[PDB]
């Protein structure tokens, strides 16, 4: 049975079908609500290298979709444009009526290549990809999503700002994936898990204002010298 959340004795609990409590009153379907909650709130690493490692390609499993009515504003979201080395798309186009997650402070747009040895991209930990009031078991191409899970429960009777951080990837979905933070189309910064979104934004801003962008036609890549808290509380060097 799918668990159902109910407030008993000033605390949330999972209601057991093998127990009829006449005190609970379900007077209308308005009391029933489905809720989507982001993995961000459980403390999972949200950097692109860590987040991507939780997804993987698989075949033989039909995709599935379930709706939810309310969601949580997300600090980190992801948007994937992955192709095979021969240029064929690695992810399916978003089905009709599936839009991106409606509230993202940072959208990590990742573009690159990988083997993609599987018909669909699934969450290796069983979580869901959260879209606009629809949660899917698989990733859709170029569609913003958040990692999350769904709960069902019985109720008792500043503005929005979004910023897009762009990445380039090679070997997507393997244990030798490489990531670059994109400053412009010819300037890139080597990326690791330590890099927070605001840190990347300030890196980009100082690179722009300090002229460290590529003033040539070639690709310029920056590696940075060093130079565990949750958010709610031609190569060269930069030291």
């Amino acid at each position: 049975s799918i668990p159902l959340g109910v407030i008993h004795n000033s605390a949330l609990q999972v209601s057991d079908v093998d127990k009829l409590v006449c005190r609970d009153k379900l007077s209308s379907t308005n009391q029933l609500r489905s809720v989507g909650l982001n993995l961000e709130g459980n403390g999972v690493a949200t950097d692109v290298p860590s987040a991507t490692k939780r997804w993987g390609f698989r075949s033989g499993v039909p995709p599935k979709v379930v709706n939810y009515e309310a969601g949580e504003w997300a600090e980190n979201c992801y948007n994937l444009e992955i192709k095979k080395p021969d240029g064929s798309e690695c992810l399916p186009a978003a089905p009709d009526g599936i839009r991106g997650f409606p509230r993202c402070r940072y959208v990590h747009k990742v573009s690159g290549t990988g083997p993609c040895a599987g018909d669909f991209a699934f969450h290796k930990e069983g979580a869901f990809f959260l879209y606009d009031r629809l949660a899917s078991t698989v990733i859709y191409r170029g569609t913003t999503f958040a990692e999350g899970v769904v709960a069902f429960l019985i109720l008792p009777q500043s503005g929005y700002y979004s910023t897009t951080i762009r990445y380039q990837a090679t070997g997507f979905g393997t244990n030798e994936t490489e990531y670059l933070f994109e400053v412009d189309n010819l300037t890139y910064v080597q990326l690791e898990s330590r890099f927070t979104p605001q840190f990347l934004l300030q890196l980009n801003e100082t690179i722009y204002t300090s002229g460290k962008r590529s003033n040539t036609t070639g690709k310029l890549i920056w590696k940075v010298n060093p130079e565990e808290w949750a958010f709610w509380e031609x190569x060269x060097x930069x030291x």
Partner: protein, 117 residues
Amino acid sequence: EAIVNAQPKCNPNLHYWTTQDEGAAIGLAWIPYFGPAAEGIYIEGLMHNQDGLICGLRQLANETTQALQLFLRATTELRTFSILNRKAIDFLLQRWGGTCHILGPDCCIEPADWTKN
């Protein structure tokens, strides 16, 4: 049982988005031609961790996943919209699926004001 939060962390605050329940729009905002675009149909709210609800919710959702996934494996429906309605039907069948034995433990009939008559 009771919900035990076993996550490494818990954001105690919940900045949530949803859609309004009806909410008769001001003037002509209800017409789709004049109404808001898909991006501007959301209401927002902030909920704190009173009664520890937020953290509990985070555990509840986690604990739901397995069961939900198994359900989605068994269904041939591409998009499932009926879980809550099925649960309401099950709520009604639990209480009124059979004959109600007054004063019984599985019958939600109270002859109190009828007792004092």
